[PDB]
Design a protein around this ligand. Structure first.
Ligand SMILES: COc1ccc(-c2nc(CSc3nc(N)cc(N)n3)c(C)s2)cc1OCCF
Ligand SMILES: COc1ccc(-c2nc(CSc3nc(N)cc(N)n3)c(C)s2)cc1OCCF
Ligand SMILES: COc1ccc(-c2nc(CSc3nc(N)cc(N)n3)c(C)s2)cc1OCCF
Ligand SMILES: COc1ccc(-c2nc(CSc3nc(N)cc(N)n3)c(C)s2)cc1OCCF
Ligand SMILES: O=c1ccn([C@@H]2O[C@H](COP(=O)(O)OP(=O)(O)O)[C@@H](O)[C@H]2O)c(=O)[nH]1
Ligand SMILES: O=c1ccn([C@@H]2O[C@H](COP(=O)(O)OP(=O)(O)O)[C@@H](O)[C@H]2O)c(=O)[nH]1
Lengths: 229, 233
């Protein structure tokens, strides 16, 4: 009975921030972090995650396939966990996901292939591994929230977070990611392998303005979104 | 399930394919699941296409391709093993599904030997193990074995059998590598020293057949042991 809502957005758009605000607004609202976020910070996954992250930074064209498969698994099992042992005693439970299996593939893994960091064989193996691994069924989303921010807004926010590894993210890379989110979540010109996705409710939220201490209007839009469902 | 699931294990060219095509024929209650990679070796579905490619890339550059190939081959197995388990033997009196090797073969024979050969690094191998644990648990519950049939031959006989099997892409296979795979088969199925992370495997009944002698024309005794073995499961 738990509603599934994905929080989607570019690097630095404000997802963790938005999700961390949402968790604290209700005992019926819970939050599944992106494992790449937990990696971007020992469990076996955390060691594995860290090593593959740096490996991928150092040579994306060697390690993209490995990164992507482990990113996605780590995400499916973290979502399935939270779904299985959370919120059973909520009247209105909603699980918010920081990104989804659909970002993993149609944004990130697609972008890496489009940049030849995966060859055709790695990409095809990846989509097949995804089309099947996701059959993970109980993960169909009830809605998607798009946190929209210009490619430029993101780059400055990369400055505000200020992690050393992020300062060399090219505005060029954000921009490609941005067109992917827009075509998927705004234009809706993306034809995926998951029937329901062409018709799932999307809520588009302009986060170009700082919302850390001025989030009421955004949370209000989410509450209304949730009512429609 | 009501289906009896039995994996046939053994070294390369031990004669598993031979024996499996013999068993499928003998009883309407018997079905086989042939190995994905064994399929790829010859010669076009999506899987076959990826299959042929990653197998060729594997052979050229194993330090680069061992992780990717191992993931695909085990995914491909789990898929096909499900397909038979939910498809065939639906009206059979005493159903038997013979798996040509198992998810355990993937992990404890081939993936393992590649980590040991330095064809997968530590991170590759622990990510692989992580997934294998999880992939078989989320997806591979109904795949659990009722028994294993170990076709046990020596590397020399197997080497002998590759040279005779006239497959040029395989004429390169060296002996010490066959020794390495044999050694891991002995440790898993004969002595049962090899630890797996699969508790129930410790206790699965195991029939070992010495298959050094040729059996193509003359396999009746082997089958009688199988049928004897089956009657205890
Ligand atoms: C120097 O070249 C690169 C170096 C690093 C990267 C990285 N991309 C990402 C995002 S990929 C990704 N996939 C996911 N499935 C999830 C998620 N949060 N992020 C990193 C974490 S590191 C990407 C790079 O270029 C990719 C070529 F387009
Ligand atoms: C097109 O070239 C690039 C494309 C993407 C990237 C990315 N780098 C990163 C940083 S990897 C990282 N490692 C960490 N250990 C921590 C952390 N926050 N981020 C992304 C998330 S995306 C970096 C790229 O170039 C890096 C060289 F400046
Ligand atoms: C470390 O040296 C080797 C280790 C293993 C092998 C193997 N080659 C093969 C043949 S791979 C293959 N590819 C195909 N595309 C078709 C087919 N029937 N077989 C194995 C099954 S194992 C071959 C090796 O040497 C080849 C290069 F000297
Ligand atoms: C040139 O060096 C090599 C060439 C080929 C190989 C191969 N090993 C194998 C066995 S991997 C495997 N994994 C499975 N899960 C199943 C199965 N039947 N085979 C091939 C099919 S090709 C291995 C090689 O060396 C590996 C490091 F010694
Ligand atoms: O309303 C906001 C949203 C984000 N940020 C900052 O922008 C950077 C990226 O935020 P976050 O980690 O939430 O982005 P994500 O990668 O999670 O989308 C961080 O320094 C935040 O503190 C901010 O100052 N105000
Ligand atoms: O007792 C046997 C079993 C098999 N073979 C032959 O040796 C090759 C290897 O056997 P198989 O393909 O069954 O080996 P697998 O790799 O499946 O274990 C085949 O061409 C068989 O014709 C043989 O000569 N004697």
């Amino acid at each position: 009975r738990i509603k599934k809502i994905s929080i989607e957005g570019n690097i630095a758009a404000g997802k963790s921030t938005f999700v961390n605000i949402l968790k604290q607004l209700s005992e019926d609202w819970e939050v599944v972090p992106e494992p790449v976020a937990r990696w971007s910070n020992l469990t076996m996954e955390q060691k594995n995650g860290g090593n593959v992250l740096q490996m991928m930074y150092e040579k994306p064209e060697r390690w993209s396939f490995t990164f992507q498969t482990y990113a996605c698994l780590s995400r499916i099992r973290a979502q399935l966990a939270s779904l299985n042992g959370k919120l059973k005693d909520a009247e209105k439970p909603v699980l918010f996901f920081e990104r989804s299996v659909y970002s993993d593939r149609y944004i990130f893994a697609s972008n890496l292939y489009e940049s030849e960091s995966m060859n055709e064989t790695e990409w095809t193996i990846y989509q097949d591994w995804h089309d099947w691994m996701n059959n993970g069924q109980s993960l169909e989303l009830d809605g998607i929230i798009y946190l929209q921010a210009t490619p430029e807004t993101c780059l400055h926010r990369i400055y505000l977070r200020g992690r050393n590894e992020e300062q060399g993210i090219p505005l060029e890379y954000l921009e490609k990611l941005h067109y992917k989110h827009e075509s998927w979540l705004l234009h809706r010109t993306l034809k995926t392998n998951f029937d329901y996705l062409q018709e799932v409710p999307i809520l588009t939220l302009d986060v170009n303005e700082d919302f850390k201490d001025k989030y009421e209007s955004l949370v209000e839009k989410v509450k209304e979104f949730l009512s429609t469902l």
